[PDB]
UniProtKB/TrEMBL annotation:
GMP binds at residues 70-71, 85, 111. The lineage of its organism: Eukaryota, Viridiplantae, Streptophyta, Embryophyta, Tracheophyta. The gene is RIP. Beta-D-fructose binds at residues 109, 111, 163. Glycans are attached at residue 227. CMP binds at residues 70-71, 85, 111-112, 163. This is rRNA N-glycosylase. Keywords: Hydrolase, Nucleotide-binding, Plant defense, Protein synthesis inhibitor, Toxin.
């Protein structure tokens, strides 16, 4: 399992956690030098457990689907929580079985539903290491409205940073001060599946995307990604959602 302690955390130790997170996701091939997540995995092998410790040393364990880096649920003390989605319900068959009770959250895990439940878009939710500490704290005591906002933070500070080096760097800059995500950060999150697909299709297309992917850059300008030479491909993205799952 992969572990992260907010007590004494600094950009370096958080860098190490995110490296571990990526290293725990299995793959058999690379496509243009980027690990390609597997089409599927059967049983409990499908799910990685992340141990997260807040500053006061309290912990949660988060279950992550290794084929797509999606959070399915988490354990907080003796209570398990799982999204209201069939994927998570299936996961509940394999992790945290020894929880004293199982609570199903009143939303699915996708950003759009989480933002509704939280009552705000992640454009206005500050993220960073302090926010992750807070998020962990919030998830320890069930509130479902507060938990939605806390999961938006957790997702972005764990999964999305694993997917993209630019996002991991954003979080490192927010090690001791939160800040809502840049628009580019949001655009990357939203393009992961698309980018993953197009990079894969590029393999029999001389490195050229079948359909260009539209991002936003750090300056706020709308940018077109058309091929694998782009820095998004060459430097930023770190994991590829397998087209079998798109
Ligand atoms: C990446 C992660 O860990 N969790 C969620 C996932 O449940 C959902 O499928 C999608 C958002 O629309 O990506 C993240 O928000
Ligand atoms: C591919 O992308 C690079 C960077 O965007 C650009 O300079 C180049 O003209 C593009 N080449 C092709 C063949 O699309």
């Amino acid at each position: 399992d992969v572990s992260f302690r907010l007590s004494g955390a600094d950009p370096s130790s958080y860098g190490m956690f995110i490296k571990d997170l990526r290293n725990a996701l299995p793959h058999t091939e690379k496509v243009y030098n980027i690990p390609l997540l597997l089409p599927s995995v059967s049983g409990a092998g499908r799910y990685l457990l992340m141990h997260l410790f807040n500053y006061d040393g309290n912990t949660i364990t988060v279950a992550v689907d290794v084929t797509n880096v999606y959070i399915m649920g988490y354990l907080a003390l003796t209570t398990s929580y799982f999204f209201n989605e069939p994927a998570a319900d299936l996961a509940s068959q394999y992790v945290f079985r020894s929880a004293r009770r199982k609570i199903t959250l009143p939303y699915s895990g996708n950003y759009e539903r989480l933002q509704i439940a939280a009552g705000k878009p992640r454009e206005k939710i500050p993220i960073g290491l302090p926010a992750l500490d807070t998020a962990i704290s919030t998830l320890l005591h069930y509130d479902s409205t507060a938990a939605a906002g806390a999961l938006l933070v957790l997702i972005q500070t764990t999964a999305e940073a694993a997917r993209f080096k630019y996002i991991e760097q954003q979080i490192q800059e927010r090690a001791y001060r939160d800040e809502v995500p840049s628009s580019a950060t949001i655009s990357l999150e939203n393009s992961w599946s698309g980018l993953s697909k197009q990079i894969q299709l590029a393999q029999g297309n001389n490195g050229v995307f079948r359909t260009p992917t539209v991002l936003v850059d750090s300056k706020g300008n709308r940018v077109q990604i058309t091929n694998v030479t782009s820095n998004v491909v060459t430097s930023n993205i770190q994991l590829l959602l397998n087209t079998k799952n798109i």
